[model samples]
Target chain A: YRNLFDKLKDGPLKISILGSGNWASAISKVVGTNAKNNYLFENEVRMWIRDEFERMVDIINNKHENTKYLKGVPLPHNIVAHSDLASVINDADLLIFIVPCQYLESVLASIKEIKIASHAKAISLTKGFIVKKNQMKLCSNYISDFLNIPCSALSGANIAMDVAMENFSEATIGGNDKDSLVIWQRVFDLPYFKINCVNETIEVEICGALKNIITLACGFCDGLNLPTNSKSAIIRNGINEMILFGKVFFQKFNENILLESCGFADIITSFLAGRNAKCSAEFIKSTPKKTWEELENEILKGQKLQGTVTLKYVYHMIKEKNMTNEFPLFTVLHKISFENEDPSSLLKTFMNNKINQ
Target chain B: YRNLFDKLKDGPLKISILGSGNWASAISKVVGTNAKNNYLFENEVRMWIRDEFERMVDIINNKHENTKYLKGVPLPHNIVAHSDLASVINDADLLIFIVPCQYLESVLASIKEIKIASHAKAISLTKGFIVKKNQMKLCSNYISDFLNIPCSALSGANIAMDVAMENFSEATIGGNDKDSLVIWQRVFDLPYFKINCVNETIEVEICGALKNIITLACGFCDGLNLPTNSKSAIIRNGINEMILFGKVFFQKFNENILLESCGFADIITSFLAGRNAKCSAEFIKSTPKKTWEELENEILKGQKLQGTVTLKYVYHMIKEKNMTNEFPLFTVLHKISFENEDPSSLLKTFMNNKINQ
Candidate 1:
């Protein structure tokens, strides 16, 4: 086994981040500090800010904090913010992708003509899938194909605010390349931020996207005033469906991967306090019955509920494959969310013996 | 390939319950109802009431409700309560053991001389191990060896009150014998109460006993005011230790068994709202320092915290084997709970790279 750091031809690996959102800002604190301290990485870290948020670059650079997105948490001084994407990513050897899923394709398109370091490797912290009709594409895979470079994924039970506050957290880094995974681990692992690497990338990325479905199911349970046992049962059913979905779609699905930070722990965190769960609970408790979109518009302001979007995509994919019967929880959840089925249908899925079959 | 029901020489199976507590009363409602409705069993279900609470027999028999324990919930008319142990177990084909774990040995001792049906089988709902110094014995295994009968175990994320309320709940019945598992499944399955059977028995029983340790850890996180991410990380670490413990101790340990209701779901439920978690959290939040027993007496009102008890037993077992490093979460939890270690040590386990290594 060759040592990855010894094989690096550059003096020190340059690192750049492709987003300046809450997760990006929180992660940069760890990434920027690690880069400054570690001999294998460059001291300066560049973060690209969107055009509309160009003012955020000045605030973050001047105050050492992303005042708009991640308030109160101080960013490392070496983490320089830039409005121009090309300047941010120029000759960067390690790219951290943390943009919103919907905007990832556009971000990639803008960077396609720009020259990156020959041996550059990227890792996406983005959570969600790109869906077109019944086709679903994992964000990491999409990035790898688009940029013509190997891409890894990092996911876990991490909340941006919690991580920024330096609360202890665990995350799973997924990739096939052992050398790249180790490098990513070194770049991200911290005393408060623990990282574990897995050889398979699909399960980790899929877990990041699919956990919201379980969160929605949990929200419905909470809304109906179900006890902890019932909520836990629903969570179990949700994870089982997630496992089945991975097995059915991916060739290298590892059931044990769900035991990692990205799978079970993430599901637990989301079920406990996710916005999707909160709104879905309110959807059930509404006076005249409000739509999910209405609740999202009201409660979340402008943010979308990934669970509802994922449920529709997953429902169509399962239906297209003629495997709807095998996924009672997902099917029922889709019907409840889109077709206006009664919220009680969520509990009836538990009665179906075919679940977890 | 032999059909179990067809092999029975007796006209129909006779079912008996060996406890009269909240869980016993709650489960009897399902068992008695199943026996009365299904053609595979006798309608009259005998339940043994301990001498001190013999008054419960009269109340259950006449009023059709477990007034003392499971108040308000109606017991089935076919469930006959008896004070005499011999009368309850006399020639019964199936025995349901649901007593408190501490009293199980004595209960079995009282019935050793009594005559049971030649083809009798049993299942234990008791949660906890029979610990003696460094040796830990699963209640199901102890019952099987003590009674000279095949015993299965039924465990899950079930709360006794929730199940009695006829809310949606799921449970796992675990046995090495396929026929026995199916029989237990038939005896317990209902629309509101779903049952899933696994071929492994050890993991099921162990999960029931071990989950409280994780619950205590979650409580400590809550007591320390750790966010959901940190709490979820602690829970993930706790489960990893549990899985490692099973792999080390049991020959029949199946990691997949943890995905069953008895494992992951039970941990989720316990962490969410178990008395163990509540007490442990209070233990952390208490001023002037109070012992676990003190918190138990004050908050739980005499109910013991199973997590603290299990942690001591597990810590001793791991220490005796010289494998304490393999179980940092359990070891640290033991220290924090028993040796006056700071609660912050709980978070330090996340920083340990050897965890889940």
Candidate 2:
């Protein structure tokens, strides 16, 4: 197959999006608008929706809005919605996979037999990981291995509604390949939505996943009514753990990426305003100490708290490696969430030399 | 002069505090308590108060509380307040400097003729810099040079009242001499007030001084009604500039020092609850565009804003080095605060590739 330059030599490339969730719909506006304005891509952008949302797809196609997921945000007219997955992927030169992690594999399987453009590259806007055989696997890596193509990642402190409203925000795009990374940057780099490119993918994806744990720690601090210094210490410890976790797991992990928008900025956003932090704080504040599952059901309307899930996975990963002691914050957080440990231990663990060292 | 261990072998070391402000009084409680509890130091801790506050000193000496500055918090009986600078420093093996930056030189000069302990060491809690012949000089270094003693620095996201209330917090002690740093740690490391030591003083001192600039940027974002993403971006950019500035100025600057409580945690605290950030937001929201001086006078009752002060020093340092464009956030903040540039240019400056690159 020819390279990206050769593919672009033929004409502007075609773009396809494989999900229509809140982030997907919000990013679709960016991609669709950029593709139309720049000659580097085709004007038309196709997005795939589940067959059950046929009426919603029609509404998006007709009214240029994703009323259910990303309400009140208008999509660009160049973006067309489709229910059939094959049609969306056919001859597309740029593919964006942004569905929920649980549905990602099934969507990939459904389109496995379909023909994809030989020059097409993929970028994952999905934020999650899967543990197979006690080893953590990033979604971007899973998609790249399954699709047999290079995949990049986009992650940052961006909120969908904030981005949809054209508020100024920054995001990091990570890829090992400079060519594909620059393309992803071009497709999403708007004046209001800034994009930074990094040379590593796993580090960015790990930051996106592990940041929830820090937010949970922040929530615990809030629930305990701790002062600002304690909360700041928790954030400092959290970032240290994140850097250590990435170094232990990925050979290509760059500590500098943690300084990017995807790492430090996103963690700050989660601490200031995140569902995981809010719920975790409430978990501590509950008189009878309601379980996380019950809190998720009641508070989040059955939506799972990603921090607890990631905490469990990270705790198990560290335990399997026999390095639980090195990760005091994560261990204490897991025990507090599941093993009935006191939430106050979070402060105690860091206060001593156990974590900050 | 004997080494620290040899000096310690003589007897429990004497301790003196060189300031009587809110932070100095609050920390005196910790030092006095630690000295009384541990066998490593003498029971009495001496703090020097200005002659003008003689009545306040009398109140502190008699009532065991700093009624004027750190009111309502009971001080340890072992801490003695002194009006004579020479008496406070005479024969003291360890000196703690917590005076304001402007008063630091005068305090040093006043006691210059007094003979100190042969093995005396000092730690500075002062946070500010002086531009001398277009070069920035740290207060800790100035103290070390003036006194001919090994001086370390202690800084963090500590609020004096929170610490006095015995709330959880952390601090970073930076010293090239491990013996000195660990000694400072021993004096200040209470259960609630955690301490971490790094082998670099300038980085810690720089973080303490420069973080106010980022808080100002955060305040601008808050005043502009920008979302979380924008504020996060400002913080991320602020840290990057800080790291770069340290690397450029100090040869022994360690970026890892930034992960300590003195760096990232302190920045978070400043962003959340700093007077600098609060007044900066007010600076932006004022109708008819009032100067920072006006806001400081109106909002803080004539108290100067540290962020604006630091911004001027940093901007001049960068400009004297002929690298204004390299630091967009600092340069832009200076212009917005002093030169009457549009506050909205902050968003525009960072949104483009200038700051993030």
Candidate 3:
């Protein structure tokens, strides 16, 4: 019942991680490390897992690791795994939301009756958009709408296992609320992990979702065994197009947001090799009749791939707005994936009617 | 006696390409293509080659290709190669300067007495800087001073062969003179080539020169076989540092420069696999006792590597300004290359004191 500042003065801040996937495990390590150092108000940081992943929760709780999702690296002793989402987040003052983007609405709906603190702040580490009828919702926006709490964002060139292995990386935290961002920074900024706080939420989230589509483009290039320079050229085009799209749709877009962790850094890393790029590469190289869903089932092992799905959502929204011509790279990507347009149309479309002025 | 408009109506504008190498030949192709299409004032585009490459001149002039430099690509019949620098540049109304940054001063010195068109405007395709005594000079600035012409810059993620092959690519032209940039774009911009013009010349040139240092950092990451996220992290750090360095020293830095072809585009393509990155990769993978000069000799066939040299100059400039702490990535690269610092210090330097504030 104490205010956040009062609790801060008396003890460390209580934190809970909502999700237990590859990314969540890495995040749990960061939160657990902060907790172990007495930087957190509570020693035990709870991580909510899907009830279907009960075995994963049991293994994590008993062995101090998420062997199924994030193998090898040991989770800190203070990180407790829980399947009851409401119980995991019940007493936590800070929530780090990391889950599949599409599952967010359902997950939040399940915990609607839980009593959360009035002063609690949440950080959405999820990167994707939800499209329901006329609305396209960023994960943080969805969380804020459901939880009635301020939700910030954390995204970057972060690959879950690499962060767990302590490979040096950087991430961007975007929030209109300065205090919330600073608090999130304390939990995330490790020696091997760097934090950059920016003041825009939409632009940051847009870069995160759009980069998956760009990664798909890069994957197509790699599938063709195109030279590195050619692949990089597509990346450059994609980044510029993404910037233009952001400016066009979100008139309040700050260009600096594109320079942050969620923008250039995320794109570069994704192009180098991510699930989106990998899946797209396999799909592009395979027979023309084979669908992306078939490839996703084979390559991702039932794990959902966001790139193709994101492209479909983006295409529909842009079409609704009747501004598809303004986004050549994205439009071409959507066509190639959904409309059965040839993949070669990518560079051709990119070359003509560019978004850059 | 006639003004440009009068001459424009009566005849083709005479254009000359200075330097003869991978980039120069590719540029020759662009000019030649423009000339062949009757897009300029002159039918024949002249190319100035080094006197030492007299045999190369004979081969290219006779065979319509620069076999020694840009081998396999046929030069247009209208592209006349000349080893006599003055003769090639004489009476030219436009000059495209393409050469290694270090050789630019001497090349200009040799042609100082040569008569050139009074109306000549030069576009420097060269990237990188020269630090002589206490002053640091960008290639465009150096050309402007020695040639007494308004010099602009054309920089991009353009790989010479890719551009020559007519791959989809874009470039940035930086100049205060709108007319000059328009004319330059006319010469360089093809259906497959895109040009985005900005008014700030110095900021564009700085991004071009500083990106080589970032490319070297990427090569170091590649040599270490670090994950793509780690490389992207270093790149983000390098970019922020470059922007800060530009802001501190240039004082009139344009933040928009980083979003241009000379900035993000150039970095992506260069890091993908340019000479600087390739040379540094070779050196890093070699023994610590092995010098960059030795690798340059072996891998590059005695061509001087711009990255190590640029790092030295940048380090000296930053140290002179007493702002070395402001540029962690550039400083670390300089130390790793020149100070015989261990190459592994790269990631360690990148992780501990990032310049992303």
Candidate 4:
């Protein structure tokens, strides 16, 4: 046993799920959003959150015979709790960043305090352009600038929510350096895992950030729950907005960017299922406060959802930075945020937009 | 240049997206379905298929940034065209099987003859239980029994048709053998490739087959364009019938089975879209075709879903087995293969059953 242990201790590969947030929880809620629910790369590390961990545990103990491969992975995870954060980071060679966009910086800053190997590779689930942080600096640029570690960011639109539900989903993993991406392969190789990485981290981080914000506005529209035509218009407009953003970003930066300006309508399906969607779907022509308070319920998950994400910080930053044409969603969302405009009036003046429910 | 050329020639590993049928072709049609989406894994000889290849070239040349990774894998791929069944089997270490159930047997029978080294693995995509297959047995069992290679069958509610359209979808790959499940891990590592492999291969496979038949019924109901409640009852009763079959198979097989019979549900959802909801609100109904023909179209998707698969095959099988059941859907769908019954009348009777829209 000791000899076997010695071989294992020959070095247990370090692994992290990256970032911390509702989506980062042990269970993934990113299901029904994609077809391949990665079982290969994901089960490599011990899940941190309680719910997803137990769900996976149930499968391993009873449902999976091959789980022995995954069993050796530590059972309980603690990164979510403040106390376990440092220990989780210290125990491994890989750092997965599953935190929401707003929280990524602070968490990394927290990781800096630990007496750890300077060489550990970092991975983040932070998607979206940090309005303030990213506008002034790219997300990867900021992370590298801060920790001096070539941090990799994961992008796409699913989280632990769907994984827990055993729903279907797919997405990508990426790093600024190919070598770094190679080392992290095992974590993403589990049965349901599928990965795609690139040397240019900026494009990934930007796509993750930008699409989410616009989608938020899309969610908000659904929360308003206008008529079907309005709903369709919002969805199409949302897609158009996504295409426009992709076009502009690609044109200004990488002409070689190979993705369509418009992609991931499935992700929109997830967001629509999320609380964001319900809040958006159930949106009534009520007071503005009605919408704001409803927003909380949406985040908490009353709607069915398409997928999930974060923008509390980005929203705050947009209010702070005030970029307009590039971010109409942000600008309009701010209108609802700042002005005491009522949707009832908006609804009445909608130019014969009212259709019978 | 010599070293680079050498690396490309004896590329440490080779990967193939097996079957390359509707699901495979669907990969090409979607956002960034690549013509060559493969990459190197942690192991030097391992190359992961990050996305569908050929279309990836289209995305890149067309410069669709949303699908940049599809147009270009983080690593290069050995795009082979002459997938002369034998050639496909000969050149790679891994085979991602996406062929139909009927063809799975022939593919496997021929696969083992190719002197495929033991290191080569077979990953199957068709899901369902076995009935009579003439001289051979059910497909999944045949593959497992014949090849003795680790084989995993893919199942889920996600329609590859929708996925090819860039819908975010997810599926489950299940197999009894541990080695066959590794494909899940390899594929899961991709950014948009979310997949999981479970060990209850039989349970999943059986449910998959069971649901294909149910989906055929659904295609028929839609052919009649039945009312909502009728559709509702079909789902309710459909689950009841599926669970009965899954329960009988699992309890007699899986030491103990208690989870909701979702495996079969997944396959049904693949055809229905938003399956299991009060209804799948997704809009593919606008597409035109004969009801039974459409199912075939929906399922293999030469053009649309290959939806009529279960019916055509089942219709064929019942004739072979000489059995009879008038359960509205089953009866109507069974009539698909016969020359004596009036297809439209049988379909109309089923659609007129009391139900909601």
**Residue B132 lDDT, candidate 1, scale 0-100:** 52
> What are the per-residue Cα lDDT tens digits for candidate 3 across B1-357?
234455577677898888878888888998888777755658788888876554887887899988887889988989887877878778888889998766887888888857867777888998888766866788888888888888889988788898888887778899877768767877877766778899878888888888878888888888888888889888888888887877777777776777777788778878777566777877788847678878888777788877777777778889998887778788878887877788788877757633234
- TM-scores for every predicted model: 0.96, 0.96, 0.95, 0.40
lDDT of 1 by residue, B14-104 (tens): 8999997889999999999899988888899999987655477788889999888898998999999899998988878899999897888
Against the native complex, each candidate's DockQ, computed on alpha carbons, is 0.61, 0.61, 0.56, 0.01
Worst 10 residues of 2 chain B by lDDT: B348-357
Minimum summed lDDT over a 10-residue window in model 3 chain B is located at B348-357
Per-residue lDDT over A42-101 for candidate 3, one digit per residue giving the tens place of the 0 to 100 score: 888888988655477788889998888788989998888887887787867899999887
* Model 4 docking tier (incorrect/acceptable/medium/high): incorrect
Q: Which model is ahead, 2 or 3, in terms of TM-score?
A: 2
In model 3, how large is the Cα lDDT of residue A33? Answer: 89
Candidate 3 residue-wise lDDT at B292: 81
The Cα local distance difference test for each model comes to 0.85, 0.85, 0.80, 0.44
- Order of quality (DockQ): 1, 2, 3, 4
lDDT of 2 by residue, B287-329 (tens): 3468778888888779998888888888888888888877988
* Residue B206 displacement (Å), model 1: 0.9
TM-score of model 2 (first chain only): 0.96
Indicate the TM-score of model 2: 0.96
For candidate 1, give the DockQ: 0.61
